[PDB]
Every structure is written in C-alpha cells, then in structure tokens.
Scaffold this active site. Structure first.
Site, mmCIF file in Angstrom:
data_model
loop_
_atom_site.group_PDB
_atom_site.id
_atom_site.type_symbol
_atom_site.label_atom_id
_atom_site.label_comp_id
_atom_site.label_asym_id
_atom_site.label_seq_id
_atom_site.Cartn_x
_atom_site.Cartn_y
_atom_site.Cartn_z
ATOM 1 N N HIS C 43 0.811 -1.331 0.135
ATOM 2 C CA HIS C 43 -0.175 0.000 -0.007
ATOM 3 C C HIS C 43 0.816 1.283 0.053
ATOM 4 C CE1 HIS C 43 0.353 0.088 4.643
ATOM 5 N NE2 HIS C 43 0.238 1.391 4.131
ATOM 6 N N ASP C 99 -0.678 -7.387 2.075
ATOM 7 C CA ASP C 99 0.014 -6.220 1.760
ATOM 8 C C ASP C 99 1.451 -6.139 2.011
ATOM 9 O OD1 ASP C 99 0.165 -3.310 1.871
ATOM 10 O OD2 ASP C 99 -0.454 -3.088 3.888
ATOM 11 N N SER C 197 4.176 2.978 8.123
ATOM 12 C CA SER C 197 3.888 1.953 7.109
ATOM 13 C C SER C 197 5.063 1.250 6.357
ATOM 14 C CB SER C 197 2.914 2.296 6.004
ATOM 15 O OG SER C 197 1.547 2.563 6.693
HETATM 16 C C1 LIG Z 1 -0.311 -0.742 12.302
HETATM 17 C C2 LIG Z 1 -0.650 0.685 11.832
HETATM 18 C C3 LIG Z 1 -1.279 1.564 12.885
HETATM 19 C C4 LIG Z 1 -1.799 2.726 12.705
HETATM 20 N N1 LIG Z 1 -1.716 3.549 11.688
HETATM 21 C C5 LIG Z 1 -1.114 2.646 10.343
HETATM 22 C C6 LIG Z 1 -0.721 3.485 9.036
HETATM 23 N N2 LIG Z 1 -1.257 2.529 7.910
HETATM 24 C C7 LIG Z 1 -2.098 2.894 6.897
HETATM 25 O O1 LIG Z 1 -2.524 4.232 6.824
HETATM 26 C C8 LIG Z 1 -2.510 1.892 5.753
HETATM 27 N N3 LIG Z 1 -4.248 2.201 5.917
HETATM 28 C C9 LIG Z 1 -4.642 2.166 4.582
HETATM 29 C C10 LIG Z 1 -3.712 2.421 3.345
HETATM 30 C C11 LIG Z 1 -6.130 2.814 4.199
HETATM 31 N N4 LIG Z 1 -6.900 2.457 5.293
HETATM 32 C C12 LIG Z 1 -6.418 2.332 6.566
HETATM 33 N N5 LIG Z 1 -7.148 2.135 7.718
HETATM 34 C C13 LIG Z 1 -8.766 2.431 7.576
HETATM 35 C C14 LIG Z 1 -9.451 0.704 7.752
HETATM 36 F F1 LIG Z 1 -8.858 0.309 8.709
HETATM 37 F F2 LIG Z 1 -10.651 1.022 7.751
HETATM 38 C C15 LIG Z 1 -9.271 -0.164 6.481
HETATM 39 C C16 LIG Z 1 -8.197 -1.146 6.478
HETATM 40 C C17 LIG Z 1 -7.956 -1.899 5.206
HETATM 41 C C18 LIG Z 1 -8.536 -1.473 3.893
HETATM 42 C C19 LIG Z 1 -9.371 -0.227 3.936
HETATM 43 N N6 LIG Z 1 -9.735 0.045 5.202
HETATM 44 C C20 LIG Z 1 -4.901 2.079 6.864
HETATM 45 O O2 LIG Z 1 -4.488 1.879 7.994
HETATM 46 C C21 LIG Z 1 -0.597 1.282 10.565
HETATM 47 F F3 LIG Z 1 0.002 0.658 9.753
#
Ligand SMILES: Cc1ccnc(CNC(=O)Cn2c(C)c[nH+]c(NCC(F)(F)c3cccc[nH+]3)c2=O)c1F
Lengths: 11, 26, 250
Positions: C43, C99, C197
């Site tokens: 991603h 991923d 990430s």
């Molecule tokens: C482990 C961890 C904890 C906090 N933040 C991050 C940063 N990672 C991301 O932003 C990746 N990333 C992406 C691309 C899209 N949606 C995210 N979160 C929203 C969601 F949990 F609802 C989700 C998960 C998978 C697919 C669609 N929506 C997400 O977390 C972490 F990798």
C-alpha cells in the site's frame, strides 16, 4: 522540512 | 550473517529494551 | 510511532526509509533483507482509493539513517530502484490482504555498522515465536500522535490473540495478518502511525540470538486508540512468494 539530498541521487 | 547487529550482538552488547522481548518468550 | 522512545544508534540497521523525490518527503518505512533487496508494504506503492501509484523512478531508498530529516553524510546510503514487485493478489479493494512488495536496488549496498540485513523466518522460527503474549519490536519515523520525531523511534508490542484482533474491528481479517498492541487494561500503550507503514515488526530468537522480521506494518484504525490494535502482514505466510521473486529475478 527535509534537508537537500545530493543532486547526484536525484539525477 | 543476517540479524546480527554490528554494534550489538557482534560485540556482545545489549540495547536498552531487548530484555523486555526475551522476558516475554516464556 | 506513538508512545515509543528514541532508538539507539545502530539499533535497527535493517531499517529503510522510502523517500519521494519531488516533493521530497517521507513515504514509508521498509527493511533490508539482502544487499540488493528491500521489503515493504504494497500500500506504500499502490493504493487506487487515494490515487497512489508510484513507479521505480519516483522514489529513492535511504539506508543507515537515524535522523528523520537530515542528510547523514558519510553514514546513510541512498539507492535507486531497478524494479518493484507487488503481490499479484494484494487486496487493496477490501482489507489490504497480502500487503507486501519487494524492491530490487539498482546496485548492491555495502554493509557497515549502520547497515545490516534482518533475517527472514523459517517455519520452525515462526512457529515458536509467533505466539500471543510474545513481544516484538516496531520502528519508524512516522507520527508521534494520531508531531514528527527528530530521530528513529522504537516500541515493543505484544502479539494479540486472533479472536481479540477479530472482535476489535469491522474489517475482515485473514490468515495473512496478525495484530499487536496492549489491551486497554494492561497500562502500557504504543502503536505505529502514519509514516510508519511498510516498516518491520521484528523479534529476537532466544535460540540463535538473531533478529527475524515476522511482520510488516500494514494498517490500523487511528493510532494507539484503546480497544484497537495495529495489523501486520504475516511475513512467513507469504515467504513462498518472496522466495519465488528473489530466485527468479536475481
Ligand atoms: C499498524 C498501523 C497503525 C496505525 N496506522 C498505520 C498506517 N497504515 C495505513 O494508513 C494503511 N491504511 C490504508 C492504506 C487505508 N486504510 C487504513 N485504515 C482504515 C481501515 F482500517 F478502515 C481499512 C483497512 C484496510 C482497507 C480499508 N480500510 C490504513 O491503515 C498502521 F500501519
């Protein structure tokens, strides 16, 4: 606020 | 040679929190 | 990283920074698994929902760093990408299943006191270390809160039981991911965050004292929220693919 990296890499 | 750090494992020095990891592998 | 601490010099020699050429900015974390290969989250490179689709000539890999923004002359090494390989079944449409992505550097990087590859787990190692309660370590230059650290941050987090991981979210969890973090009543906190990430989740084998990368920082809902946990790509589960790419393309 990243420091300029050498152009030799940006080429 | 993977996973052995030059400044730590290679010189038999531990980083400040790795013990927390090993302590959890009960 | 949220609720982490500054890493010591040389503490994570396999830590890699994915750097965007222009505008110059931090994209993601990554890890060094050989003198020519880097492992990161797919991603970080491809995610249609946010119109993200980077190519080899759009990014740079910075190895051996400690400071987030400074050009650490004589210490860090910057490298170009020859090719990027994303898992053919990476599910960006639903839950970021599989991923994972591999990046082949144009030229081998020379190892040093600050640059050294991490090991990939074998079946036996994965079996004995990937257990609920056992702690792993996450590192990155990501945000400190859901602002930006001066140097690489580090945090140790316990692996969580699959049922608990499942019951904390609406997202469909697969066998290709595991979650980690403290439970709301355990007192301690910590989590990865934006910018982290693609980074490595590592564990130290008590058998041979080597560090192994068990996961890749993948996704989460917010950062360090109570009742929520960070999710990581299960590296061993996808090793068959990793091995295929490596011995088939160099
Ligand atoms: C482990 C961890 C904890 C906090 N933040 C991050 C940063 N990672 C991301 O932003 C990746 N990333 C992406 C691309 C899209 N949606 C995210 N979160 C929203 C969601 F949990 F609802 C989700 C998960 C998978 C697919 C669609 N929506 C997400 O977390 C972490 F990798």
């Amino acid at each position: 606020d990243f420091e300029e990296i050498p152009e030799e890499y940006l080429q | 040679d993977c996973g052995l750090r030059p400044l730590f494992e290679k010189k038999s020095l531990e980083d400040k929190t790795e013990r927390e990891l090993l302590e959890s592998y009960i | 990283i949220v609720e982490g601490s500054d890493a010591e010099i040389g503490m994570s020699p396999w830590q890699v920074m994915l750097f965007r050429k222009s505008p110059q900015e931090l994209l993601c974390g990554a890890s060094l698994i050989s003198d020519r290969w880097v492992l990161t989250a797919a991603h970080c490179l491809l995610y249609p929902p946010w119109d993200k689709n980077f190519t080899e000539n759009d990014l740079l890999v910075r190895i051996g760093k400690h400071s987030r923004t400074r050009y650490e002359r004589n210490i860090e090494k910057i490298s170009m990408l020859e090719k990027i390989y994303i898992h053919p079944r990476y599910n960006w449409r639903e839950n970021l299943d599989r991923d994972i992505a591999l990046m082949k550097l144009k030229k081998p990087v020379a190892f040093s006191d600050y640059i050294h590859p991490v090991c990939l787990p074998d079946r036996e190692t994965a079996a004995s270390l990937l257990q609920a309660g056992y702690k792993g370590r996450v590192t990155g230059w990501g945000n400190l809160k859901e602002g930006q650290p001066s140097v690489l941050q580090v945090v140790n987090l316990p692996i969580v039981e699959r049922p608990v991981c499942k019951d904390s979210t609406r997202i469909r969890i697969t066998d290709n991911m595991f979650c980690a973090g403290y439970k709301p009543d355990e007192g301690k906190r910590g989590d990865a965050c934006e910018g982290d990430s693609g980074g490595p989740f590592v564990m130290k084998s008590p058998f041979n004292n080597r560090w192994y990368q068990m996961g890749i920082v993948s996704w989460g809902e917010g950062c360090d929220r109570d009742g929520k946990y960070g999710f990581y790509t299960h590296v061993f589960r996808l090793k068959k693919w990793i091995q295929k790419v490596i011995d088939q393309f160099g």
